[PDB]
Design a protein around this ligand. Structure first.
Ligand SMILES: NCCOB(c1ccccc1)c1ccccc1
Ligand SMILES: NCCOB(c1ccccc1)c1ccccc1
Lengths: 87, 87
């Protein structure tokens, strides 16, 4: 659905000649290629292999990102404030 | 306690206009953000996940650091003495 919405939006933006049509077109291209895993389930070779990604792999990747991004922000604000003074 | 002590010290230093108040203020900001894990225990979602850090994760990270830092010093002194002579 997202790939379809962005593609429709990108083509709508291209009609209005706004420069932001290209980023949406490129994001649609990235999402569309990633959507090709949906058709791996049609073959026993690729279907069984791609089972153990959504169950465990994809879930725990989100867990690290949320915790890490919070303290990435905490250190980023710390470094900028401390580095504002020159020698 | 450390975050409170450094924050009090940093504000005390700021009254005396010493430049070292900023590093203590920034260290307090880093520690204060890290103290936010204490409130993860209030939710079942985050409480159970954050259990397996203090028991095993944090302890063994200290083990590597103490052993590695000793021989980091040993190689550092070795490299400087050996690199003192130019070609
Ligand atoms: N040369 C075709 C190999 O096919 B795959 C495959 C073949 C037999 C059994 C299981 C998998 C495959 C390749 C990449 C990713 C996932 C599966
Ligand atoms: N979108 C909320 C996800 O919540 B977390 C979560 C949800 C259900 C079960 C276990 C944990 C979570 C996220 C990051 C780190 C730790 C836990």
């Amino acid at each position: 659905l997202l790939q379809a919405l962005l593609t429709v939006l990108s083509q709508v933006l291209r009609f209005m000649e706004t420069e932001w049509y290209l980023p949406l077109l490129v994001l649609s291209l990235v999402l569309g290629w990633l959507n090709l895993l949906y058709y791996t389930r049609g073959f026993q070779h690729t279907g069984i292999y791609s089972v153990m990604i959504q169950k465990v792999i994809l879930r725990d990747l989100l867990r690290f990102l949320l915790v890490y991004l919070v303290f990435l922000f905490g250190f980023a604000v710390a470094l900028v404030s401390l580095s504002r003074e020159a020698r």
